[PDB]
Design a protein around this ligand. Structure first.
Ligand SMILES: CC(C)Nc1nc(N)c(C(=O)c2cccnc2)s1
Length: 294
C-alpha cells in the first residue's frame, strides 16, 4: 500500500491476499490483508467494524480497517508462524502433549469469548491459528459468510479445505451455530495428537463419507432431525461407528472423552467452548514454551 512497504506475501486467504508489511511511519510490522468488486457492502464492513472491538489474548488483534478503491484492507497484529507450519515442523517427533493441551485450552478460551459475544469463526483450520514464541496461540481470519458468503475458492482458483467442516454444514444447514467451531477445533485437536488430518476429504461428499466411516452414519437416534436435512439422502451408505480408541491413539481417556464431546453429530449435544474448558482433561494444563524456528 501507500503507507505500507510490503515485506512479503504471507499467504492467499479465502478472501484475498495477506502480506507482511511495515508501517513506514510507525515502523510497526503487521499482517495486511487486501480484500477481493464495485462498491463493497456497507453492512459487511459493520460486521468487520464489530470485530475491531473483539479483543482477547487468543484472538489476533484487528488494528485497522481501510476501504478504498474497491479494495478492503484489514490490518492485523503480526504473528510469526501458523499452526499448520508448526505441525509440519513437528511431524517427526510430534507436538508435546502439554503444548497440545495448552493450545487447545487457549483456543477454547478464545472461542468461549467469541461465542459469548455471538461471533462465530466458521472456518477454523491450522493455517488460521497463529502462534508466537511466548506460547500463545490466536484465532485469525474469521470467516465472514454472514457478511460475504461461502467462496468457491479464496478469490482466484484455490482448493478450499473441507477437512474441518462440521457435518451440519455439509448436510446443507443454512444457519450455523457456535457448534461448528467446536467441531473444527476437535478435528484440529485430533490432528495435533495423531499428526495426521482426521477427515481429509477432497470433495464435499468424500468429506461427509469420511466422517460417516469413522463416527458412523448418523441417524435419528444420535442426531434427531438429521434425515430431514437439506442434503441428506436416504441412500447414504450405513457405516458402523468405529471404536474411538482406534481414531486418536495414543491419546489418554480424558482426551478421548473431550474429543468425543467435541465431535458429537448433534450440534445441540456438542460440547460448548465454556463447558469444554471445565473438562477434566485440563486439570493439569500449563503454558509451555514452543520451540519455534523462524
Ligand atoms: C507468517 C504468518 C503466519 N503471519 C500472519 N500474521 C497474521 N496476523 C496473519 C493473519 O491475520 C491471517 C492468517 C490467515 C488468513 N488471513 C489472515 S498471518
Amino acid at each position: 500500500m501507500e503507507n505500507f512497504q510490503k515485506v512479503e506475501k504471507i499467504g492467499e486467504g479465502t478472501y484475498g491476499v495477506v502480506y507482511k508489511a511495515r508501517n513506514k511511519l510507525t515502523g510497526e510490522v503487521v499482517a495486511l490483508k487486501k480484500i477481493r468488486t464495485e462498491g463493497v457492502p456497507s453492512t459487511a464492513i459493520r460486521e468487520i467494524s464489530l470485530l475491531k472491538e473483539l479483543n482477547h489474548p487468543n484472538i489476533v488483534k484487528l488494528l485497522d480497517v481501510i476501504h478504498t478503491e474497491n479494495k478492503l484492507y484489514l490490518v492485523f497484529e503480526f504473528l510469526h508462524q501458523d499452526l499448520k507450519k508448526f505441525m509440519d515442523a513437528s511431524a517427526l517427533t510430534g507436538i508435546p502433549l502439554p503444548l497440545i493441551k495448552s493450545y487447545l485450552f487457549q483456543l477454547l478460551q478464545g472461542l468461549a469469548f467469541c461465542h459469548s459475544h455471538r461471533v462465530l469463526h466458521r472456518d477454523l483450520k491450522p493455517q488460521n491459528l497463529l502462534i508466537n514464541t511466548e506460547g500463545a496461540i490466536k484465532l485469525a481470519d474469521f470467516g465472514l459468510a454472514r457478511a460475504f458468503g461461502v467462496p468457491v475458492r479464496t478469490y482466484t482458483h484455490e482448493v478450499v479445505t473441507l477437512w474441518y467442516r462440521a457435518p451440519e454444514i455439509l448436510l446443507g444447514c443454512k444457519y450455523y451455530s457456535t457448534a461448528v467451531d467446536i467441531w473444527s477445533l476437535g478435528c484440529i485437536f485430533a490432528e495435533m495428537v495423531t499428526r495426521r488430518a482426521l477427515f481429509p476429504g477432497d470433495s464435499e461428499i468424500d468429506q461427509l463419507f469420511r466422517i460417516f466411516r469413522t463416527l458412523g452414519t448418523p441417524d435419528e437416534v444420535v442426531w434427531p432431525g438429521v434425515t430431514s436435512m437439506p442434503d441428506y439422502k436416504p441412500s447414504f451408505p450405513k457405516w458402523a461407528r468405529q471404536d474411538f480408541s482406534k481414531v486418536v491413539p495414543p491419546l489418554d481417556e480424558d482426551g478421548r472423552s473431550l474429543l468425543s464431546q467435541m465431535l458429537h453429530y448433534d450440534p445441540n449435544k456438542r460440547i460448548s467452548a465454556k463447558a469444554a474448558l471445565a473438562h477434566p482433561f485440563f486439570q493439569d494444563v500449563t503454558k509451555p514454551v514452543p520451540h519455534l524456528r523462524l
